[PDB]
Design a protein around this motif. Structure first.
Motif, PDB file in Angstrom:
ATOM      1  N   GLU A   1      -8.995   4.929  -0.641  1.00 47.87           N
ATOM      2  CA  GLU A   1      -9.323   4.717  -2.122  1.00 47.87           C
ATOM      3  C   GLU A   1     -10.878   4.857  -2.421  1.00 47.87           C
ATOM      4  O   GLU A   1     -11.581   5.254  -3.255  1.00 47.87           O
TER       5      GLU A   1
ATOM      6  N   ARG B   1       5.545  -2.144  -7.015  1.00 53.82           N
ATOM      7  CA  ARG B   1       4.887  -3.577  -7.397  1.00 53.82           C
ATOM      8  C   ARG B   1       4.413  -4.300  -6.342  1.00 53.82           C
ATOM      9  O   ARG B   1       3.405  -4.596  -6.558  1.00 53.82           O
ATOM     10  N   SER B   2       4.879  -4.068  -5.312  1.00 47.45           N
ATOM     11  CA  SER B   2       4.209  -4.931  -4.048  1.00 47.45           C
ATOM     12  C   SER B   2       3.192  -4.392  -3.459  1.00 47.45           C
ATOM     13  O   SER B   2       2.154  -4.870  -2.891  1.00 47.45           O
ATOM     14  N   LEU B   3       2.950  -2.884  -3.770  1.00 49.34           N
ATOM     15  CA  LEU B   3       1.700  -2.427  -3.200  1.00 49.34           C
ATOM     16  C   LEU B   3       0.667  -2.398  -4.419  1.00 49.34           C
ATOM     17  O   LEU B   3      -0.567  -1.927  -4.226  1.00 49.34           O
ATOM     18  N   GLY B   4       1.154  -2.941  -5.653  1.00 47.56           N
ATOM     19  CA  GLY B   4      -0.092  -3.369  -6.373  1.00 47.56           C
ATOM     20  C   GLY B   4      -0.037  -2.654  -7.884  1.00 47.56           C
ATOM     21  O   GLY B   4      -0.749  -3.118  -8.841  1.00 47.56           O
ATOM     22  N   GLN B   5       0.770  -2.055  -8.278  1.00 45.33           N
ATOM     23  CA  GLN B   5       0.964  -1.232  -9.474  1.00 45.33           C
ATOM     24  C   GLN B   5       1.776  -1.976 -10.189  1.00 45.33           C
ATOM     25  O   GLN B   5       2.406  -3.191  -9.954  1.00 45.33           O
ATOM     26  N   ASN B   6       2.240  -1.314 -11.311  1.00 43.35           N
ATOM     27  CA  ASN B   6       3.464  -1.753 -12.234  1.00 43.35           C
ATOM     28  C   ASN B   6       3.880  -0.623 -12.963  1.00 43.35           C
ATOM     29  O   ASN B   6       3.620  -0.709 -14.269  1.00 43.35           O
TER      30      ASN B   6
END
Ligand SMILES: [Ca+2]
Ligand SMILES: [Ca+2]
Ligand SMILES: [Ca+2]
Ligand SMILES: [Ca+2]
Length: 148
Positions: A82, A37-42
């Motif tokens: 990326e 979640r902190s690296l940007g996912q969910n």
């Protein structure tokens, strides 16, 4: 390389402990999803426990260090930036305007190394293909490459 260097294992050791809430030697679902979640996912715990279970050596469903090194190896080798994914997506897309058609995808993934037949290409596509269009887009590609 395919195998990790003492510097990368070192840091995949420093990351391992950082993530651990209890401070043991096992990562759970809950521990890793908080970093995700902190690296940007969910993802949810469920979507986590899925990819956990695949990569479990022992089977147990908690992440030990040689399976974190197996995980993060398989990550860190593949993903650069990326931006690397994007340029390699629009290397794969022949014309370049949007989508990698089944046809384009076959030919360039066949030039890369495993030889794919038509139906082997279709099947790669189909599981990820939201339109049903027979083409692979950038968000479908990034989803697809993640999976198999
Ligand atoms: Ca733990
Ligand atoms: Ca395990
Ligand atoms: Ca195209
Ligand atoms: Ca599609």
């Amino acid at each position: 390389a395919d195998q990790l260097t003492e510097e990368q294992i070192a840091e995949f050791k420093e990351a391992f402990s950082l993530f651990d809430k209890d401070g043991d030697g096992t990562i759970t679902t809950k521990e890793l999803g908080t970093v995700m979640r902190s690296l940007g996912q969910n993802p949810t715990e469920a979507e986590l426990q899925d990819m956990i279970n695949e990569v479990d050596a022992d089977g147990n469903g908690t992440i030990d260090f040689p399976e974190f090194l197996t995980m993060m190896a398989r990550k860190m080798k593949d993903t650069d930036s990326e931006e690397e994914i994007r340029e390699a997506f629009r290397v794969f897309d022949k014309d370049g305007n949007g989508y990698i058609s089944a046809a384009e995808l076959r030919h360039v993934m066949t030039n890369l190394g495993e030889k794919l037949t038509d139906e082997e290409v279709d099947e790669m596509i189909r599981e990820a293909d939201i339109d049903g269009d027979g083409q692979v887009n950038y968000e479908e590609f990034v989803q697809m490459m993640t999976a198999k």
